[PDB]
C-alpha cells in the first residue's frame, strides 16, 4: 500500500473501551472528611459525555480504599483486546499522588500500575487515560489581572 505514518493511535477497534468512573461523595465519619456536594453532577456529565464518545461507562459510588484497588485490579484483568483505549475518572478528595477512598487514601501509583504495559497486555500500546478531580496539595493561586 501507500506510505504509512502511524502518528495517531488506532481508535477503530470494535470497542472504544471502558470508562470507569469512581464517584466518592460520602466518606466515613471516622475519616473526618466532608461530603463532596456537586460531584453527582460531574459523574452524570461524564457518563453522558463519554457515552456519546461510544465508551462503555461503568459508574461506582462511595468506594472504600479496598474497593478502589479491587475494582481497578479486576478491570485490568479483563480482556481489552477488542478495545481501542481505557479511561478512568477519579472524583474525590486527594493530596499529591493520592486519591481518597471512603475510608482512607490510595496511592495513584498503585491504581495505575495495574495497567502498566507489562501487567495488562491487552492494553499494551493503547492509550490509558486517567482523569483526576482532586486536590494535589494546599496551595492557592491568587491569580493576576490581565
Amino acid at each position: 500500500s501507500g506510505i504509512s505514518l502511524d502518528n495517531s493511535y488506532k481508535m477503530d477497534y470494535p470497542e472504544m473501551g471502558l470508562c470507569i468512573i469512581i464517584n466518592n461523595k460520602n466518606f466515613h465519619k471516622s475519616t473526618g472528611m466532608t461530603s463532596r456536594s456537586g460531584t453527582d453532577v460531574d459523574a452524570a456529565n461524564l457518563r453522558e459525555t463519554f457515552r456519546n464518545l461510544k465508551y462503555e461507562v461503568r459508574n461506582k459510588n462511595d468506594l472504600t480504599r479496598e474497593e478502589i484497588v479491587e475494582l481497578m485490579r479486576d478491570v485490568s484483568k479483563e480482556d481489552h483486546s477488542k478495545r481501542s483505549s481505557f479511561v478512568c475518572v477519579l472524583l474525590s478528595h486527594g493530596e499529591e499522588g493520592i486519591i481518597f477512598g471512603t475510608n482512607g487514601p490510595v496511592d495513584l501509583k498503585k491504581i495505575t500500575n495495574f495497567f502498566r504495559g507489562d501487567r495488562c497486555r491487552s492494553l499494551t500500546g493503547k492509550p490509558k487515560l486517567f482523569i483526576i478531580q482532586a486536590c494535589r496539595g494546599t496551595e492557592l493561586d491568587c491569580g493576576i489581572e490581565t
Binding site: 481508535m11 456536594s37 499529591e96 492509550p127 492557592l140
Partner: protein, 103 residues
C-alpha cells in the same frame, strides 16, 4: 553511527508509556468545585469534549479545557483565605501518538 543503547533486536517500549493524566489542578494546589454545578475541571472537560471531540486531537482539547478553567473561574468564599482564587489544570502526557476519538 552506532551505539550501545539504540536499535535493539527485540523491540520493547517503557511499561510507563501510553499513559495520560489529566489533572484538574497544578501540582501542590487545591482543586475547586462548585457545590451546585460540579468541579470547574469536569464541567469544562465535558463541555470541550462535547464541542471538540469530533474535531480536535485530545491534547488540543485539553489545552482548551486549561484556558476555560483559567479564564472563566474564580472562587467565592466568605473566608478571605479561600476567596478570589484561580485554578489551572495540568496535562501530564506520556503518550506516544496523537489521540483522536473519531476515525
Amino acid at each position: 553511527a552506532s551505539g550501545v543503547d539504540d536499535d535493539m533486536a527485540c523491540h520493547k517500549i517503557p511499561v510507563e508509556a501510553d499513559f495520560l493524566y489529566a489533572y484538574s489542578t497544578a501540582p501542590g494546589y487545591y482543586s475547586w468545585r462548585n457545590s451546585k454545578d460540579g468541579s470547574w475541571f469536569i464541567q469544562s472537560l465535558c463541555a470541550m469534549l462535547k464541542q471538540y471531540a469530533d474535531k480536535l486531537e485530545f491534547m488540543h482539547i485539553l489545552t482548551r479545557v486549561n484556558r476555560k478553567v483559567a479564564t472563566e473561574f474564580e472562587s467565592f468564599s466568605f473566608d478571605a483565605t479561600f476567596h478570589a482564587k484561580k485554578q489551572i489544570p495540568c496535562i501530564v502526557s506520556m503518550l506516544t501518538k496523537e489521540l483522536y476519538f473519531y476515525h
